[PDB]
């Protein structure tokens, strides 16, 4: 058994290990086993023929494998010759990105642009080895073939080369007459689909070996679809040094499937009631498309808003403002999110949570601060893991949830620990979600909460059907989604099968996740559609909404009382200059900011600063009071005056300016000192009441509507004031923001 090299005695050559590639310029990633073997195969084939076909299944790293082949033959025999990459238009971005992320030493030039860029790139014909990889689409190369037929190309790389399966293709006939040393084809689909196309690619590879006239003979020698081992070994040995295909199943070191699971939830009584209310809001008056094209857009916006949570609208929240167990119960989506986050904490999975709606971001933040979970944010200003709650949370102090937004996802963060993603607010296009989820890796589990038989159902089913229209390439009806027969019970249909179905969806490992029925639906490359069959309920509800002695003494007593009040008011007036500024009856985005409210620069012009005090506070404490002291010391003296003379009570605010502004004399930093604390200072006791803050907000909104100036408020934190801070933010929105006043809340 000495006959090892019985195949013409050809030597075993060598193996290109990963350290060799890393030394030769590779920087990007650590390749996998089969990827390293494929790079070895590409090198061995470059040495001993004119081209080959790397037919790995799509998504296995063919692009980075060709980049690694470049790194090899650039740092093994110093082949600085031009590498011409021809790709489809959609993947030129990926090619240009990976060429600079994996092979930064190799200068990559993209021959793209118009006729102006045609001439400006004819300018850079210096051929000084200032361009190592020329990347181009198919069409720009096809048109500008005159300039692209005058280079000693050592490597040509045709990505997704199934466009060359027709041997009479114009680009095939153009590329056949090029000066290429090694022609490499990249092909995702099974080239064995038809022997004609396989032989076409082979003839493009080796035009003299696989001659065209032999096509017929070829197809007659392998017409058999049966195995026929005695004749199958022939084809296998022939195609061995030319083709290399590996199925995804053949790779155990493949990245975990990151199974995207669409999970189903119900509704709430408030949700269904407001859904059928906002469907009957404007009654869809217009006939076809004159206003339905935009009215239905607004309607769908509000519908997905209600499905997320009804508290998005201004008037849905109850007048008593305090968080409780109703946030979870006022929305089946948030209830499912609660149970899912509980299961994730039980399994120990740190999770991401995106948001197209930033008000949904605020409400998710409030929920996290309620149930005690550590988190960050995306923009604006965060206080959960800042402010004074950062020292202790009911959840683990290390971050457990991340809060993100799709539009503001370009800020740049590192989230290596995240192995779970939740898409509560599903975008109508998942193209944004791809770059959203790219941050998880750079055993993941992507989850999307959507309510059953709702608008989100069609939105995502249409999104998935459109996402499948990429490789192998109305609004009324879609909006309607007539399944209301299921929501005709007017109940909530609160999901509770999920308490067991969640454990039945994933058996979590001790530290990471470990591997289409009732609620779970696994997206495993399949077609999914809906047809909204039961629209008769829609028509029915449409028709249904289309149907629609002692008082004499009281008077004398009140006359005497008002006379006494007149006398005492005149006494107070002529005592000294003692007066109020706000009176009861006299006639949309809460963007946060970082800094100190004493320096308000929001929109320049006028600036109304707001503060909260109690009767006879005068000089004390520090913080914002000290800061405004530093700002001309106006409130100290003005208050001191007002407190000398007993000139305030629950409510009411004094207005007054500080220093001066030379940029614009019309703009001044206005101030405000609200009185909301308890007037139990007779026995030098204190406490805070919140009911007076409501009328204080009323009167300051009146004043800010009269003067139309920017309003600026403090954090109002640094104590056990979460109830009033929740209610106070919501009341600031109710009275200032949601009533058309530029409000700004200052942090840090």
């Amino acid at each position: 058994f000495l006959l090892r090299l019985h195949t013409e005695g050809r030597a075993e050559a060598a193996r290109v290990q990963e350290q060799d590639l890393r030394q030769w310029g590779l920087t990007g990633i650590h390749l996998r086993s089969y990827q390293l073997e494929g790079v070895n195969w590409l090198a061995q084939r470059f040495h001993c023929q004119n081209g080959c076909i790397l037919g790995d299944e799509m998504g296995l790293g063919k692009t980075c494998q060709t980049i690694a082949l470049f790194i090899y033959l650039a740092g093994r025999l110093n082949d600085e010759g031009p590498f011409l990459i021809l790709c489809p238009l959609s993947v030129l971005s990926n090619w240009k990105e990976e060429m600079q992320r994996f092979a930064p030493g190799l200068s990559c030039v993209t021959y793209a642009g118009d006729k102006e860029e045609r001439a400006c790139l004819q300018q850079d014909l210096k051929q000084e080895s200032r361009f190592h990889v020329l990347l181009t689409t198919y069409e720009i190369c096809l048109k500008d073939a005159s300039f692209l037929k005058s280079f000693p190309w050592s490597v040509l790389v045709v990505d997704e080369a199934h466009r060359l399966k027709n041997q009479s293709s114009l680009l095939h006939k153009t590329l056949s007459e090029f000066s290429v040393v090694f022609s490499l084809l990249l092909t995702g689909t099974p080239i064995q689909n038809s022997l004609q196309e396989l032989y076409s690619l082979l003839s493009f590879v080796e035009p003299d070996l696989f001659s065209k006239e032999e096509v017929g003979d070829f197809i007659q020698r392998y017409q058999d679809i049966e195995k026929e081992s005695e004749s199958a070994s022939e084809l296998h040995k022939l195609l061995q040094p030319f083709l290399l295909r590996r199925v995804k199943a053949e790779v155990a070191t493949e990245l975990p499937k990151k199974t995207e699971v669409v999970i189903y939830h119900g509704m709430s009584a408030l949700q269904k009631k407001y859904y059928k209310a906002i469907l009957m809001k404007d009654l869809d008056a217009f006939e076809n498309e004159t206003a339905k094209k935009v009215k239905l857009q607004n309607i769908l916006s509000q519908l997905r808003k209600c499905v997320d949570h009804p508290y998005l609208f201004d008037g849905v929240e109850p007048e008593p403002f305090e968080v409780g167990d109703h946030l979870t119960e006022a929305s089946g989506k948030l209830h499912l999110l609660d149970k899912l986050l509980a299961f994730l904490y039980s399994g120990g999975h740190r999770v991401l949570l995106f948001s197209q709606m930033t008000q949904m971001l605020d409400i998710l933040q409030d929920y996290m601060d309620y149930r005690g979970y550590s988190y960050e944010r995306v923009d604006g200003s965060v206080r959960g893991e800042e402010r004074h709650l950062a020292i202790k949370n009911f959840g683990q102090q290390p971050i457990f949830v991340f809060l993100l937004s799709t539009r503001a996802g370009g800020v740049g963060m590192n989230l290596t620990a995240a192995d779970t993603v939740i898409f509560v607010d599903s975008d109508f296009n998942p193209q944004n979600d791809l770059q959203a989820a790219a941050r998880a890796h750079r055993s993941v589990k992507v989850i999307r909460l959507i309510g059953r038989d709702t608008v989100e159902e069609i939105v995502y089913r249409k999104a998935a059907s459109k996402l499948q229209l990429t490789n192998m390439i109305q609004l009324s009806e879609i909006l309607k989604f007539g399944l209301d027969k299921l929501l005709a019970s007017e109940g909530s249909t609160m999901d509770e099968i999920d308490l067991e179905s969640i454990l039945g969806e994933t058996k979590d490992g001790q530290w990471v996740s470990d591997a289409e029925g009732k609620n779970h639906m696994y997206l495993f490359e399949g077609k999914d559609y809906s047809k909204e069959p039961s629209k008769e309920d829609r028509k029915s509800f449409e028709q249904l909404v289309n149907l629609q002695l002692e008082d004499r003494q009281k008077k004398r007593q009140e006359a005497a009382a008002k006379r006494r009040r007149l006398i005492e008011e005149k006494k107070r007036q002529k005592e000294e200059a003692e007066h109020k500024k706000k009176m009861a009856w006299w006639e949309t985005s809460l963007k946060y900011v970082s800094g100190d409210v004493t320096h308000p620069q929001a929109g320049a012009e006028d600036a109304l600063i707001v503060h909260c005090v109690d009767d006879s506070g005068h000089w004390g404490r520090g913080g914002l009071f000290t800061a405004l002291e530093k700002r001309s010391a106006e409130p100290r003296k003005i208050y001191e005056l007002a407190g000398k003379m007993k000139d305030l009570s629950l409510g009411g605010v004094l207005l007054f300016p500080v220093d001066d502004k030379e940029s614009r004399n019309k703009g001044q930093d206005l101030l405000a000192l609200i009185v909301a604390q308890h007037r139990d200072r007779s026995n030098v006791l204190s406490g805070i009441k919140m009911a007076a803050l409501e009328e204080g907000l009323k009167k300051i909104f009146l004043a800010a509507k009269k003067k139309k100036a920017s309003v600026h408020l403090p954090r109002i934190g640094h104590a056990t004031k979460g109830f009033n801070w929740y209610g106070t933010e919501r009341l600031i929105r109710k009275h200032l923001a949601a009533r058309g006043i530029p409000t700004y809340i200052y942090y840090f």
């Epitope: 238009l89 240009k96 793209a112 118009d114 006729k115 860029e117 770059q435």
Partner: single-chain antibody, 230 residues
Framework: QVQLQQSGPGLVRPSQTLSLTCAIS??????????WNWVRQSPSRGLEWLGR?????????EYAVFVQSRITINPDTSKNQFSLHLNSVTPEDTAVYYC?????????????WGQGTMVTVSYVLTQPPSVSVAPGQTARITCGGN??????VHWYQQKPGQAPVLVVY???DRPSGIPERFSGSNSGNTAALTISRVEAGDEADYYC???????????FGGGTKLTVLS
């Protein structure tokens, strides 16, 4: 595909500063093969190019002479967005504003467009303002320029209320998804768009656009409204 969403006030008072921020999702702001353009549209003033900003080893802003004295387009790499600012806005600026991306692999032909924000307050190329056609027949839209063969034409189709959609780029190259019946042509001082087997869904406005390199700015066409006879 990339997404270019936009936010701003759809109700700017006179003598104010119109600010409009377009955020990018799916691509980087400093893309070496991209240039980010602001373009407005109105039935009166037509479809005018406002400005653009690009990055070719040096951030370069290029504004139109119409508002060269009262415009400012600023990038933001941190937020991955671009902001447009217009000073002393007149009622003539009441229009619908879009952000687009000129991509070099497509001959900077404005592949993907925005959604449109309705703000309420040096090169000739002609188009036929109105072209009819019958179903099954073939329609031809002529973009008559001055030696337009020495430039790259870009044909867009805009539906009523919809954003402009690039139909052909670099004279005749067609982006994926567009049916093969739409064919581009360019020769001498005449470009053309040919629609074979005109269906009912082809009735829309059709614009041709090029880039004047002498005065260095984008120039659009007057427009062509296609009429099908269903």
């Amino acid at each position: 595909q990339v997404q270019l969403q936009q936010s701003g006030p759809g109700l700017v008072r006179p003598s104010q500063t119109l600010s409009l921020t377009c955020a990018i999702s799916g691509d980087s702001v400093s893309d070496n093969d991209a240039a980010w353009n602001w373009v407005r549209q109105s039935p009166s003033r037509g479809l005018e190019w406002l400005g653009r900003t690009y990055y070719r080893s040096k951030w370069s802003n290029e504004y139109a002479v119409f508002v060269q004295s009262r415009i400012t387009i600023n990038p933001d790499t941190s937020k991955n967005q671009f902001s447009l600012h217009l000073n002393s806005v007149t009622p003539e600026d009441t229009a619908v504003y879009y952000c687009a991306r000129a991509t070099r692999p497509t001959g900077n032909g404005l592949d993907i467009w925005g959604q449109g924000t309705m703000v309420t307050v040096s090169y000739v190329l002609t188009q036929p303002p109105s072209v009819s056609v019958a179903p099954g027949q073939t329609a031809r839209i002529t973009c008559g320029g001055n030696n337009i063969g020495s430039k790259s034409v870009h044909w867009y189709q805009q539906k009523p209320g919809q954003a402009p959609v690039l139909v052909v780029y670099d004279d005749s190259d067609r982006p994926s998804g567009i049916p093969e019946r739409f064919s581009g042509s360019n020769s001498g001082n005449t470009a053309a768009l040919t629609i074979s087997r005109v269906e009912a869904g082809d009735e829309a406005d059709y614009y041709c656009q090029v880039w004047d390199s002498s005065s260095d700015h984008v120039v659009f066409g007057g427009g062509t409204k296609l009429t099908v006879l269903s």
